[PDB]
Amino acid sequence: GSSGSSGRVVVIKKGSNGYGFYLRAGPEQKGQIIKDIEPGSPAEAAGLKNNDLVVAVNGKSVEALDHDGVVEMIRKGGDQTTLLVLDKEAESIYSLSGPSSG
């Protein structure tokens, strides 16, 4: 079973206003976080989800790339592209720095 379980597979196809999902540089964790999902968009109709951490794109390791890197791969998929996000362990813990003040 080449493809494991830890990580769902999404599928989208460029429609009108692009795909319907943005990306941002997440914390230490590897991968890109999704957000600002557009309604009735190929991204929302695909099964995406806000705060979705992507580790691979079209069977490629992007968790090692940067905003541009990952975002680039997508532009390569052409019309449609597959996304690999984690569900069981998607949330990311935030460090604790900066004690009360003023």
DSSP 18: S
Sign of CA dihedral 64, 70, 72, 78: positive
**Which amino acid, 65?**
L
Angle, alpha carbons 50-31-95 (nearest 5°): 80
What structural domains does the chain harbor? 1-102 (2.30.42.10)
- The tokens describing 51, both together, are 């705060």
Method: NMR
Q: Name the β-bridge partners of 83.
A: 10, 57
DSSP 27-78: SSSSSEEEE-PPTTSTTTTTT--TTPEEEEESS-B-TTS-HHHHHHHHHHST
Whether 37 and 48 have beta carbons less than 8 Å apart is answered as: yes
Angle, alpha carbons 60-35-53 (nearest 5°): 35
